[PDB]
Scaffold this active site. Structure first.
Site, short mmCIF file in Angstrom:
data_model
loop_
_atom_site.label_atom_id
_atom_site.label_comp_id
_atom_site.label_asym_id
_atom_site.label_seq_id
_atom_site.Cartn_x
_atom_site.Cartn_y
_atom_site.Cartn_z
N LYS A 74 34.27 51.85 21.51
CA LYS A 74 34.64 50.45 21.29
C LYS A 74 33.93 49.43 22.23
O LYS A 74 33.33 48.49 21.72
CB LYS A 74 36.18 50.28 21.40
CG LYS A 74 36.67 48.85 21.16
CD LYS A 74 38.10 48.79 20.65
CE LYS A 74 38.51 47.37 20.36
NZ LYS A 74 39.85 47.30 19.71
N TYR A 103 38.20 40.98 56.29
CA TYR A 103 37.77 39.63 56.67
C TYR A 103 38.91 38.86 57.37
O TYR A 103 38.65 38.18 58.36
CB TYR A 103 37.29 38.85 55.43
CG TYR A 103 35.95 38.17 55.62
CD1 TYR A 103 34.76 38.82 55.33
CD2 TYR A 103 35.88 36.85 56.07
CE1 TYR A 103 33.53 38.19 55.50
CE2 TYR A 103 34.65 36.21 56.24
CZ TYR A 103 33.48 36.88 55.95
OH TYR A 103 32.27 36.26 56.12
N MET A 119 34.16 40.89 48.60
CA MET A 119 33.25 40.86 47.44
C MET A 119 32.41 42.13 47.31
O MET A 119 32.16 42.57 46.19
CB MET A 119 32.33 39.63 47.52
CG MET A 119 31.70 39.26 46.20
SD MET A 119 30.74 37.72 46.26
CE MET A 119 32.06 36.52 46.13
#
Lengths: 325, 336
Positions: B48, B233, B281
């Site tokens: 899919k 962080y 990130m």
């Protein structure tokens, strides 16, 4: 349904190069005697590394997170110095730096140990900053494989020691660089507006695949999650969790359809999600429907979901088509 | 076999950051399990969304024993046909555009009719050779008789609180069914996501069900030895006790969710270690512990072999379907 031929009409993230150049000029409008440095990490914050680098030609220097992105820039005939943020996390990443002339950033003890242990022709430009307080500044200064004097990139109560320790060190009015404001993202919760001469570059567009009319008291959404029996003409947009959209937040997420803001309803599937328009409204199959960007900021959408706007623009998978204007 | 690396990926065998290893041996094993219970049933994969983040083209070449293929859009079906695939391709959710009908007949695809807009466009369009159509979504419309009278459809069709009523209406109709909901609590069956080694419900959490997850999300170990105070962080901070910590190179910009700050399981050197702090990130920190010292550059698996994806998804809160499809272009695909 009124289309002519194949032009890819599903999940699409349009990037305005005109707003990108505008945001860089806004930084120069306040600081004209400053060194402008972008801000092109994680595939230029999901906007594409190579296309925005060609656009930001006025930028004095570039900044990436890993060597892989820096090698792609240098191969695309860029001459401007590339800054390696977070530095190198391998000892074998040092000779590729001295060969492609890349400006690394030293902060951990492991990369300082690898710098003194490795011998290579031509030194590299190093930057420093933190994330009581080790005085490894003199150890970095005495290094043989570093361009002396190094360079410092500080920020605008817990630290404060970095400010007084950087005073005798030289020395590269001013020379400050931006965070994410070069794309039109504030991103601060103090002011999530960022409309004051700031335009968002990424406009996450989609398509209105089908429209369903309840005409009866049915809050059912196939059988996963219920909402309200209030009769309203529903519309389904072609964007799911498998495209990059978060499954989080039910009734309350804003979606801009034909200028008017309409709230997102129910759960999110793999390829599509439903949105509440209204029975009085007339929304035909094949409408604009923008998730974040122009008309509705990304900081506003991120606040309604709960996450930061940094993830929203980087979470997008290879399924979304990159449009450039 | 593995296709020629598309422009452009790294040439480092010792890895740098984010890698999703797909083992083809389990992909073939899961398909044999379906045939073990149902031998006289045609198998219909189940590709899919870029094969659920495992790669459309590489798994299609591997699942050669599969009697038929099933995709969500025409773009994926055209990629399969171009890679010399002769098996019938089933277009799930069907076509949304009227211009998607002449390409369907020319490339011999099997569309799925459910909405009125699809049926209106089928009667309005004239094209040589009819298309094989599958049926399955005033209240409860009898548009079955309308679909049967259509000129551009291979007759007969071909079908796949609300209800039981649909299962009652398909009984007089002839004569090719395919469901899609459950295989084991026939002549044709189609699995859900069990062909990859993922359970569609956390009833058993793949524990003793046979088994073997294909995608094993690997990374690389890139402090102090102390727990410290500013843990990552910032914002989310844990304990201060003297314990060995570790940081792995996978962030929210790679495909990992920032949800569930503490308690998320991560398999490092066989032993299960809990994820701590927040997610950045490009990287995230994990609590190793005092016992046994680990080196920088270890295996570190997020989900797959050793730790199931259903178990990780339950700890975060989301379904395993998102976890395998949320992965962006930053992750490298290994088969090898």
């Amino acid at each position: 349904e009124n289309l002519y031929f194949q032009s890819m009409k599903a999940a699409i993230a349009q990037i305005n190069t005109a707003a990108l150049r505008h945001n860089l000029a806004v930084v120069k409008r306040h600081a004209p005697q400053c060194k402008i440095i972008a801000v092109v990490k994680a595939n230029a914050y999901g906007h594409g590394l190579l296309p925005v680098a060609r656009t930001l030609v006025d930028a004095d220097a570039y900044a990436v997170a890993r060597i892989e992105e820096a090698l792609m820039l240098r191969s695309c005939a860029v001459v401007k110095p590339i800054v390696l943020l977070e530095g190198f996390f391998s000892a074998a990443d040092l000779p590729v730096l001295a060969a492609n002339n890349l400006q690394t950033a030293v902060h951990t003890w492991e990369q300082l140990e690898a710098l003194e242990q490795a011998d290579l022709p031509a030194p590299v430009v190093a930057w420093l900053k933190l994330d009581e307080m080790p005085a490894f500044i003199e150890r970095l200064a005495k290094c043989k494989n570093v361009v002396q004097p190094f360079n410092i990139m500080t920020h605008f109560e817990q630290i404060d020691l970095f400010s007084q320790l950087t005073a005798p060190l030289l020395g590269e009015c001013d020379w400050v660089r931006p965070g994410v404001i070069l794309y039109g993202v504030s991103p601060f919760p103090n002011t999530v507006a960022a409309d004051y001469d700031l335009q968002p570059v990424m406009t996450l567009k989609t398509q209105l695949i089908a429209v369903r009319d309840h005409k009866a008291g049915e809050p059912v959404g196939y059988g996963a999650n219920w909402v309200s029996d209030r009769d309203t003409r529903l519309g389904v947009i072609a964007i799911g969790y498998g495209d990059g959209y978060p499954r989080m937040a039910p009734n309350g997420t804003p979606v801009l359809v034909n200028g008017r803001i309409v709230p997102l309803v129910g759960r999110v599937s793999m390829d599509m999600t439903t949105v509440d328009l209204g029975p009085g409204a007339t929304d035909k199959a094949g409408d604009e429907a923008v998730l974040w960007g122009e008309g509705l900021p990304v900081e506003r959408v991120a606040d309604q979901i709960g996450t930061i706007p940094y993830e929203l623009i980087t979470k997008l998978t290879s399924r979304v088509f990159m449009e450039y204007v």
